Ligand binder design. Structure first.
Ligand SMILES: [Cl-]
Ligand SMILES: [Fe+2]
Length: 302
């Protein structure tokens, strides 16, 4: 094939959730080598695959439900933070599609923010009350993902100059995206090459192969992650900026093969953000430069 498989199961460092700090400390030298060698990071987290599979299966069931209805919790009827991104359900619109950088987006998806988990603003939690099986599992997977991604952030911070501050990822600003690809038709590409705007992304094991990453030399590879306990950690463009371009964004894409009549591909990813209101910073010429612009301004800039 043009794109080789990249085996990680039995190869990436093992990080037990009941043991996450000690195991991330032990894994740190290997994870640094991944970021340097590949441009993205990986850990095997025993048991995470079945927790994520269960959560995504409840999301799929919530997408098919005829009362309550996930469409009743579309982002345009969900209370939104005054300062923040948009949480709630993003329906697939077959007449005027949502565009991902100009390209129709073949999915319906939900953003479960740390704010939403806490019912912030009041009523944002309504979807988690309407679909409690999903809601409990989404909060479970959000929390596991936020603990893992926070410790990947410490690995990256550790590689940067002394004086690099804590990334200070914001629980409430951080979003778990849960995806149900649909209306795929003859598409081979579900998502063209891109990176996340935010600090870090944590790719949880998807239902199907097809997520691909580019290596430093421009070689595209396909991590073996479907059905696994492997998580991938992505550099987002806020950290590329904070690092003065040392760590490029972990550019990736999603391809697929033909699958049965409306076979349900599912995927979930944690997007970790700092506080929108907080000032930017960058490590420039070996030490911290404080910026006037905020992390919110960074997002608005694009
Ligand atoms: Cl992304
Ligand atoms: Fe992505």
């Amino acid at each position: 094939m043009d794109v080789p498989l990249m085996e990680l199961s039995g190869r990436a460092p093992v990080v037990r959730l009941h043991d996450i700090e000690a195991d991330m400390a032990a894994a740190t030298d290997a994870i640094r080598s991944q970021l340097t060698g590949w441009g993205f990071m990986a850990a095997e987290v025993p048991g995470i695959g079945e927790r994520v599979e269960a959560m995504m299966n409840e999301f799929a069931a919530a997408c098919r439900a005829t009362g309550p209805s996930l469409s009743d919790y579309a982002y345009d009827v969900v209370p939104q933070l005054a300062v923040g991104g948009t949480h709630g359900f993003f329906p697939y619109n077959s007449e005027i599609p949502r565009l991902a950088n100009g390209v129709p987006d073949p999915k319906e998806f939900i953003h479960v923010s740390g704010a939403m988990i806490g019912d912030q603003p009041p009523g944002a939690g309504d979807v988690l009350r309407a679909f409690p099986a999903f809601g409990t599992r989404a909060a479970e997977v959000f929390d596991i993902a936020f603990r893992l991604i926070s410790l990947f952030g410490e690995v990256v911070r550790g590689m940067m100059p002394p004086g690099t501050p804590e990334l200070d990822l914001s629980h409430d600003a951080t979003n778990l995206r849960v995806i149900h690809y649909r209306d795929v038709g003859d598409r081979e590409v579900l998502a063209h090459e891109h990176s996340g705007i935010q600090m870090l992304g944590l790719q949880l094991p998807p239902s199907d192969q097809g997520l691909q990453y580019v290596l430093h030399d421009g070689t595209w590879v396909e991590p073996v992650i479907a059905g696994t306990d492997v998580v991938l950690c992505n550099i987002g463009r806020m950290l590329t900026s904070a690092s003065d371009g040392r760590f490029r964004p972990s550019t990736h894409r999603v391809h697929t093969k033909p699958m049965p009549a409306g076979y349900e591909r599912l995927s979930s990813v944690l997007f970790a953000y700092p506080q929108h209101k907080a000032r930017q910073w960058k490590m420039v010429d070996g030490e911290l430069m404080s910026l006037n612009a905020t992390w919110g301004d960074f997002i608005d800039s694009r």
